[PDB]
Amino acid sequence: TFRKSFDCYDFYDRAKVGEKCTQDDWDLMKIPMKAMELKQKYGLDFKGEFIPTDKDMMEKLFKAGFEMLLECGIYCTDTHRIVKYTEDEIWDAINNVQKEFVLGTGRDAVNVRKRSVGDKAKPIVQGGPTGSPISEDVFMPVHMSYALEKEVDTIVNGVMTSVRGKSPIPKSPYEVLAAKTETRLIKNACAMAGRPGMGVKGPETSLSAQGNISADCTGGMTCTDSHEVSQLNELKIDLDAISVIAHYKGNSDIIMDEQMPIFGGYAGGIEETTIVDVATHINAVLMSSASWHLDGPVHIRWGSTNTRETLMIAGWACATISEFTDILSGNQYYPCAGPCTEMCLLEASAQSITDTASGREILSGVASAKGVVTDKTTGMEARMMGEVARATAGVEISEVNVILDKLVSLYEKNYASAPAGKTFQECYDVKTVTPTEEYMQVYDGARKKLEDLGLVF
Template identity: 30%
Template structure:
């Protein structure tokens, strides 16, 4: 049973007073360290995909305890939104475990996967908030959506609209946000896949722009809109309004994104896994249809490194063993398109995501998703092919493959190859990759076959 908006708002206004600086610097880090010690949670670098189910259960219980003891800090009021043990238990029982994505013949029903599941995750390639120029947005959408294994399209951020820089909370943000959606849908239409689910809301960080993404001609039933948590275990009225509006006033699927920062307030891999579980539970209590938990390393800005993969997979396995809900994963990679490293990173993270039981996967997002137009369909193609190839893989076998791939890129994460932009590695007329990029793709795919990945 969902808590009512009035109940949530009242708690944000009347909950225990908490100073944000104290919460970030002392209270949350101290509590995380205590929980890691009390639940005996220890990082194991030898297993990027953890095989110890009791450890995964411990992370889930520690995350639940963290949310129960601290709650969520509303930064607009300086008060804690608290939940009772019964509310957490009931909220987890009533979490969505079956949703509809797409429209018409493109409709798909999503149900939860588990570690080692033989079903293929929902594969949704796309920029996932990467900055894509206005003129290239529909072209990029077409090139990616036409990939045979693509089952959705995750849209970009539009950094400039009609030649003008888009600023947060400005009127222009409203129109750039709407264009993000209409250009994505136009690209999907050109790809011959009308009705394919679109994921959006990446440009519209302000509330009016966020709502504009769901106005006439925008996101609709079967599509998904994303809003992000405030790291860590915090929220503000702008985000709370987005969450409550989408989950209570629309039929668009709400993706609520609790991406923890490993090495920041969340601490190391053990405590990052704990806060990931707590924030995942927070998302479900507030009304998320889908939620995520992909740790980002503060030092490299990626989710490719060993610690980030371990923390993300451990918490996810624990959630899947204790809750029937739907979780998604995306991947910030270090390298750029037209490089072998990007494909190695993507393959490793995809194997980990499939083996640990994520329900929805997108990636790899090149160059930490920060450089404009540094994207192509080919990195997504390989990762979708890998996802199909390794469904049902045992976690131990997944670890063997991932460690072979780590050798190829792990020491390069902090100084990766830049690669090439969309216009440099793709033909804009045919939307086919350059000969150089195609050769790299075929080389890496052959290497993956040589280490035991059997493509279908």
């Protein structure tokens, strides 16, 4: 049996005396070799499906992911050593995951409960800039565009490009100011939308351990908000994250562990990356003591989470995780196209269909324009994300797989030419925080195409 339930403290201990190893040995040999080995050993073959129906294949994927974590362990970048778990420690973690939890407070609180593949229940809609850079002068208005949408349940924070006119440089006092201010302003935006108690997810503007740790404050982040911590690529972590985890646990905060496996990355192709994905979903509740895990498979070239391959990876990972564990999870949205474009909505829609049908409990989006273009994220994308989630809930998986194949085909040949889209200021009337007729027309066009594919809103 295990000595004690594994936690961030055990990780630190082991990271200091674990097997020495270069990062190249890990990225260019250990990880890719194991992913390759397990894929063949278990004969994993997704056969073009976005969401699996073959439970035998799913079980093999689960065993593969479990074995990957067990045999490889986790690489600690700071100490350049490997942390290994025992089989009993992993099971103790999987066997005792958080069953459910509440986000937000008052009338605005929402319950997060497990969803199974093809579940009739709608997933939680977490809308916001999704970590994208937002100008300080429109920080509240932008977030308000999500709070005003009834489709949105909780908010995923954007990043303040500046606070008091200064860049929140990591480890500078401005980073601390931004960490606290971020959620304070966002919750104020929610209050202005008549929903003061909406839960949020962050802190996003802060990057350092000290910055993230300063986010919990009066008027800001509290225990009813999702607290983020990020795993690295692949099956890797830094000590800063380990300390942040200790802080979250010490404040009784809901913890959201994230990991964005890279398709075509160190793991390799589809099945290989999915094995890693299952392994990191598991590692989330083991290493990070996560309340829930946020996925986000991204294409090495396109940098999007909604390519055919990344959707398949997320679908299989979640369906498998939902089938064999009680781990709560979500997925993040990174479309290629920007706001106010049909492609952006269709890209997000494809992922919403995939996530909803595969069993995700939370949809966190949308980081339009790949989430790296200032002010290019609006509540309209989250609205589509939510409406599509509703339309998808309860639909037969065989039908969903057909719809996805057709939908993805409508844009997968235009990644290199994805329309840049517009900023919040360009497709919304900033003063009243309402979309322009232009955006409303684009929205209708995208909706019509989804309906022609078979979706019923």
